[PDB]
Amino acid sequence: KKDINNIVKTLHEWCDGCEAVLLGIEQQVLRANQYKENHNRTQQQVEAEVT
């Protein structure tokens, strides 16, 4: 019988679990990419220097 409250409450929770852990990896990647940007950035800077 009428479970709607619990079930409806519930979908997001599971989603949250994946969302949180997956996000953590995501940001770690993001920051890593940011490092990529600085690394490539500095690489480009040296490129500019060579001319």
Partner 1 sequence: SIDEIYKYDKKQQQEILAAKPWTKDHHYFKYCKISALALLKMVMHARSGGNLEVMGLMLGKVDGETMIIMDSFALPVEGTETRVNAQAAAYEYMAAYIENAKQVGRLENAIGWYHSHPGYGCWLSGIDVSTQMLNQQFQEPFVAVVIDPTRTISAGKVNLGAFRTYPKGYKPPDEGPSEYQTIPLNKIEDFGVHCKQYYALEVSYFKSSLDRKLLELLWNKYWVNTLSSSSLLTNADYTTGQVFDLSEKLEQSEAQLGRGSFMLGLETHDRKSEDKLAKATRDSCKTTIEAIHGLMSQVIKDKLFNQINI
Partner 2 sequence: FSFKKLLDQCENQELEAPGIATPPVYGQLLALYLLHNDMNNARYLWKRIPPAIKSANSELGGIWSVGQRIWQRDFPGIYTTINAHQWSETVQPIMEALRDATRRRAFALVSQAYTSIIADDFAAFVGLPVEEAVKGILEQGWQADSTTRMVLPRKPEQQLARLTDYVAFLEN
Partner 3 sequence: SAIKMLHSRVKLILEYVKASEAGEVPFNHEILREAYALCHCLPVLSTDKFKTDFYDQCNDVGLMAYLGTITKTCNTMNQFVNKFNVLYDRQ
Tell me which residues touch partner 1 (CB under 8 A): 10, 12-22, 24-25, 29
Q: Which does 8 bind (CB under 5 to 8 A by kind): partner 3, partner 2, partner 1, none?
A: partner 3
How many residues are recorded in the chain? 51
Q: Tokens in use for 30?
A: 């993001």
Query: Which of 18, 48 has the CB closer to partner 3?
Result: 18
- Helix (H) or strand (E) holding 33, with range, is helix 11-50
Binding range to partner 3, per CB under 8 A, among 14-22, 27-35, 41-49: 14-22
Task: Report the Cα–Cα distance between both ends of the chain, in Å, rounded.
Answer: 76
